[PDB]
């Protein structure tokens, strides 16, 4: 009896862990495209500020 109780508890644990993993992976991917847009905008502003020297 006590063995089977332990078994049920563990399966509950693993299922919740799986779902949390998937959600985190999605978030991280979003963060990389944030990086890319940041650099792009910096390039634009860099050019703007440079050009006035003419």
């Amino acid at each position: 009896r006590e063995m089977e109780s332990f078994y049920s508890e563990l399966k509950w644990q693993e299922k919740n862990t799986l779902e949390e993993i998937a959600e985190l992976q999605g978030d991280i991917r979003r963060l990389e495209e944030d990086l890319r847009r940041k650099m792009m905008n910096l390039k634009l502003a860099h050019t703007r500020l440079e050009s006035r020297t003419y």
Binding site: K43, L44, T47, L49, E50
Partner: peptide
């Protein structure tokens, strides 16, 4: 000019 533009890049120490 603005973003999404062919002329945008990093220029040498324009500060």
């Amino acid at each position: 000019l603005n973003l999404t533009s062919p002329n945008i890049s990093l220029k040498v120490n324009p500060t």
